[PDB]
Amino acid sequence: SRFVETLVVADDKMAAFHGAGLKRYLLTVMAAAAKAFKHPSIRNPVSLVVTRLVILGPQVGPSAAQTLRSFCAWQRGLNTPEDSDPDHFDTAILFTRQDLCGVSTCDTLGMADVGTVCDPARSCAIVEDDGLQSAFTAAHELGHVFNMLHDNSKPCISLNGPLSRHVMAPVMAHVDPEEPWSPCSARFITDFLDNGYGHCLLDKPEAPL
Numbered sequence: 427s428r429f430v431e432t433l434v435v436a437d438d439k440m441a442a443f444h445g446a447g448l449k450r451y452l453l454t455v456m457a458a459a460a461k462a463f464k465h466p467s468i469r470n471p472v473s474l475v476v477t478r479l480v481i482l483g484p485q486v487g488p489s490a491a492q493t494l495r496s497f498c499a500w501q502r503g504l505n506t507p508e509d510s511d512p513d514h515f516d517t518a519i520l521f522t523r524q525d526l527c528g529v530s531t532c533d534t535l536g537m538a539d540v541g542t543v544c545d546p547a548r549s550c551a552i553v554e555d556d557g558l559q560s561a562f563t564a565a566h567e568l569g570h571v572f573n574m575l576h577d578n579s580k581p582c583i584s585l586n587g588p589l590s591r592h593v594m595a596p597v598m599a600h601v602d603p604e605e606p607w608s609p610c611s612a613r614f615i616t617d618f619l620d621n622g623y624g625h626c627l628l629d630k631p632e633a634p635l
């Protein structure tokens with residue numbers, strides 16, 4: 427049994443748009459993401475548990491990289507040193523209505539650092555809330571936090587075989603409901619946990635939302 431104690435943050439733009447329904451919306455999005463992380467195709471399921479919810483702070487702008495870095499610096503200040511403190515969280519995810527962009531286009535919907543889930547200085551993800559598929563983007567970004575690569579990467583070719591229908595496709599496409607995670611994704615999270623990088627995921631949270 428593994429539990430990810432999750433801080434969910436929504437910016438002022440999320441509050442402006444969603445209003446009174448924002449909390450319920452965020453919990454609905456996170457419930458759908460949590461469902462993906464329990465699917466047997468992941469090989470080593472984890473329970474994504476919302477433990478803290480902040481409605482706004484960090485500097486949010488078009489640059490996905492800058493927004494991720496600002497958010498990740500800011501979230502550190504909310505955390506506590508020890509995982510046994512009930513206020514401690516294992517990962518931080520920001521939802522924003524800001525159109526996040528890369529170097530040349532604004533097609534990106536989110537960003538996360540890779541393989542950082544039990545590093546409180548780096549366990550961070552951002553998601554552009556599209557209003558419908560935000561749970562899939564959240565799952566993709568959290569996949570990265572769990573050390574997953576894209577399914578068209580060189581290592582995934584040999585793990586997935588010759589025969590873009592998974593969460594870790596590089597761009598959103600229709601996800602296979604019987605296999606949201608590719609064999610590559612399953613292998614990478616499994617290795618990550620087997621190698622001890624999920625050492626902060628063993629304590630069970632007292633007060634889930």
Ligand SMILES: C[C@]1(CNC(=O)COc2ccc(Cl)cc2)NC(=O)NC1=O
Pocket residue numbers: 528533534535536537538562563566567570592593594595596597598599601
């Ligand atoms: C740059 C970019 C662009 N991709 C996205 O923003 C979102 O990608 C997906 C979302 C949902 C699903 Cl199901 C599949 C893919 N950011 C990122 O984290 N990896 C990337 O290559």
Ligand SMILES: [Ca+2]
Pocket residue numbers: 431509510511512514515629631
């Ligand atoms: Ca804890």
Ligand SMILES: [Ca+2]
Pocket residue numbers: 525526527532533534535554
């Ligand atoms: Ca965008």
Ligand SMILES: [Ca+2]
Pocket residue numbers: 429431509515516626627628629
């Ligand atoms: Ca923990």
Ligand SMILES: [Zn+2]
Pocket residue numbers: 566570576595596
């Ligand atoms: Zn990605």
